[PDB]
Amino acid sequence: SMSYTWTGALITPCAAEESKLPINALSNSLLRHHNMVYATTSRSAGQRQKKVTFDRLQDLDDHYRDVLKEMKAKASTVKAKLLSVEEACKLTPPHSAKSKYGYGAKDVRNLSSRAVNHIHSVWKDLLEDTVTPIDTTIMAKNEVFCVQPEKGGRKPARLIVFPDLGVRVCEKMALYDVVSTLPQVVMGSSYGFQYSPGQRVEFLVNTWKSKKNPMGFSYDTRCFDSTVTENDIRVEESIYQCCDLAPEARQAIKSLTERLYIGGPLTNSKGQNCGYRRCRASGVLTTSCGNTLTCYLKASAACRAAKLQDCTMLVNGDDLVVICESAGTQEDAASLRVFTEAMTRYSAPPGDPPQPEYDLELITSCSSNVSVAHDASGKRVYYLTRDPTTPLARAAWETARHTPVNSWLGNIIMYAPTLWARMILMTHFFSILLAQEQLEKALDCQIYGACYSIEPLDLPQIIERLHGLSAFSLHSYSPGEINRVASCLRKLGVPPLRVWRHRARSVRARLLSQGGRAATCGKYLFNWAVKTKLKLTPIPAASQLDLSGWFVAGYSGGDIYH
């Protein structure tokens, strides 16, 4: 069936959309080639519509059925519970889209009577009606990128499809516990969202080392959400139903599947019918879990079809990497074509075709790779990094323009051991926070799709707890990593190391001069910049720090605030 059908009504904005990075003295000090940075807007929604609209063909074989049986068996060991209306209300982000029924996210978090009474009504109706399609809104994502002259053209806006606020609270009630618990039980060590960046590195390295002649590849499904069929969504539901659930949870999950997850009508911001969806909704609670399970199922079965030798998967939504034993270069290339043939058969045809990699460092998964540096003792050590272009482009935008969720703070947290986050992101943003006297202001950021309020001054103990003390003393980064960063700096017109070190020394001295938590930021975050390194010792606040709840599950599109 077609992933979408369209009426002709436009995907509309409801406010101004800015497409060009503004000229701003603060962002210019970070990167001067502002014309390389752009944001997606509703003006390219039609381009995206064309790309995501296609007919899906799917055939299922024994390998698929076998894997599915195994998955269901593990799922049958899971017990999940309903959230109360209050517990669900409290998971709603403060800036979550307001209801069309006369209330907003503040009213939900405040447990206002209008909000809470409406949520109750929505739930009752889910129980009473398991057929009528639930309305969704479709909007164009506004996201920031750098131009890629080599790829030929710019990225069009992604589309987000989401039901009303009251429905979203109901999804939490029925499914938050399931989507939080089930993926790891079903997929075990292959479920990527259980890992911090350090733990993902450890898994990838240990997995690579476990093969005699390792080969790895990432598999890029073309528009994954669009490839998800009604069968797939019903298969997902059948896995959820393997859990030990309360009778009302079972009914709510069935109703949500029939009326929301399988498909339904699409309404623009102006209330006009834009069309109909028969694929994954990008903005529901089950998007991440659903995609992860389905990607895992198809890939696992495809591994068996291609006769890949000792294949280990790492899956995060639609993002997939496979590490296995090489059978030789020609044999590996052929195997990857069979794997791709099988994925296609299962309705996950490829974007870029997979290519075998024999150096773990060159495998990009979840837009990131393993790299090497040295700690203070000189020990060669592994850490997670990525190409810094998108992080820097977004940091420039977020410097010039106030944004709901910043990405720069999440990037500092996740990529704290990297040379680019330390050299550029920490230096830039602490300089800004100093100037504005906003070091003390908590900021919203995202980790694995979930929103968190984080205090910049707590960054030293967060980083220690997450990455270890070595994060403040890594050095001797790989030539490839250094070169990748230097290329990006030239491309974006970012200042060189000499300038960031001078900036960092000044930021550091100011921080130290202020005392308290500010001084601890100066000492630990910027120790790299000074000639005479201080001895960094364990931060007491770090040993009372529980960050495990940050790396439980993915929630991208799922409207979660922790």
Ligand X SMILES: CCc1cc(CC[C@]2(C3CCCC3)CC(O)=C(Cc3nc4nc(C)cc(C)n4n3)C(=O)O2)cc(CC)n1
Was 318 annotated as part of a binding site?
yes
Q: Using the rule CB under 6 A, is 473 a contact of ligand X?
A: yes
Q: Using the rule CB under 6 A, is 526 a contact of ligand X?
A: no
- Evaluated on CA atoms 201, 202, 205, 211, the torsion sign reads negative
Residue closest to ligand X, measured at CB = 475
DSSP E strand boundaries for 289-448: 309-316, 319-325, 369-374, 380-385, 443-447
Report yes or no: 412 and 391 within 8 Å, Cβ to Cβ.
no
With CA atoms as reference, report the closest residue to 432 among 37, 25, 38.
Answer: 25
Distances from the Cα of 494 to the Cαs of 34, 459, 500, 546, in angstroms?
10, 24, 10, 36
Q: Using the rule CB under 6 A, is 327 a contact of ligand X?
A: no
Q: Using the rule CB under 6 A, is 490 a contact of ligand X?
A: no
Considering only residues 421 through 450, tell me which ones interact with ligand X, judged by CB under 6 A: 422-423
User: Residue 302 or 485: which CB sits closer to ligand X?
Assistant: 485
CA separation for the pair 32, 383 (Å, rounded): 29
Amino acid at 518: A
Name residues whose C-beta falls within 8 Å of residue 528's C-beta, 6 or more positions apart in sequence: 422, 423, 472, 473, 475, 504
User: Residue 60 or 376: which CB sits closer to ligand X?
Assistant: 376
H/E segment holding residue 136: strand 136-140
- Whole-number minimum distance, CB 528 to ligand X, in Å? 4
Report yes or no: 413 and 463 within 8 Å, Cβ to Cβ.
yes
Which one of residues 419, 450, 457, 463 is an interface residue with ligand X (CB under 6 A)?
Answer: 419
Choose one: 183-191, 330-338, 463-471, 473-481; the region binding ligand X (CB under 6 A): 473-481
User: Residue 432 or 469: which CB sits closer to ligand X?
Assistant: 469
Q: Using the rule CB under 6 A, is 469 a contact of ligand X?
A: no
Choose one: 18-26, 91-99, 218-226, 419-427; the region binding ligand X (CB under 6 A): 419-427
CA separation for the pair 230, 264 (Å, rounded): 12
Query: How many other C-beta atoms are found inside a 10 Å radius of the C-beta of residue 6?
Result: 17
Choose one: 122-130, 139-147, 288-296, 472-480; the region binding ligand X (CB under 6 A): 472-480
Report yes or no: 235 and 290 within 8 Å, Cβ to Cβ.
no
Query: How many other C-beta atoms are found inside a 10 Å radius of the C-beta of residue 156?
Result: 20
- Whole-number minimum distance, CB 547 to ligand X, in Å? 22
User: Residue 353 or 496: which CB sits closer to ligand X?
Assistant: 496
Angle at 94 between CA 455 and CA 517, to 5 degrees: 10
Which one of residues 307, 475, 490, 502 is an interface residue with ligand X (CB under 6 A)?
Answer: 475
With CA atoms as reference, report the closest residue to 226 among 350, 5, 52, 345.
Answer: 52
Which one of residues 261, 528, 555, 561 is an interface residue with ligand X (CB under 6 A)?
Answer: 528
Considering only residues 383 through 412, tell me which ones interact with ligand X, judged by CB under 6 A: none
Q: Using the rule CB under 6 A, is 499 a contact of ligand X?
A: no
Q: Using the rule CB under 6 A, is 542 a contact of ligand X?
A: no
CA separation for the pair 304, 362 (Å, rounded): 25
- Whole-number minimum distance, CB 376 to ligand X, in Å? 4
DSSP E strand boundaries for 349-471: 369-374, 380-385, 443-447, 450-454
Choose one: 82-90, 170-178, 456-464, 470-478; the region binding ligand X (CB under 6 A): 470-478
Q: Is 169 exposed, middle or buried (0-12, 13-18, 19+ CB in 10 A)?
A: buried
User: Residue 330 or 377: which CB sits closer to ligand X?
Assistant: 377
Q: Using the rule CB under 6 A, is 536 a contact of ligand X?
A: no
User: Residue 367 or 476: which CB sits closer to ligand X?
Assistant: 476
Report yes or no: 344 and 351 within 8 Å, Cβ to Cβ.
no
Interface pattern 166-205 for ligand X (x via CB under 6 A): ----------------------------------------
Which one of residues 415, 477, 526, 551 is an interface residue with ligand X (CB under 6 A)?
Answer: 477
Q: Using the rule CB under 6 A, is 147 a contact of ligand X?
A: no
- Whole-number minimum distance, CB 525 to ligand X, in Å? 10
- Whole-number minimum distance, CB 510 to ligand X, in Å? 18
DSSP E strand boundaries for 424-501: 443-447, 450-454
Which one of residues 77, 355, 476, 513 is an interface residue with ligand X (CB under 6 A)?
Answer: 476
Binding residues (CB under 6 A) for ligand X: these are 376, 419, 422-423, 473, 475-477, 482, 485-486, 497, 528, 533
In the annotated binding site, the residues are 220, 318-319
Instruction: Give binding residues for Mg(2+) as ranges.
Output: 220, 318-319
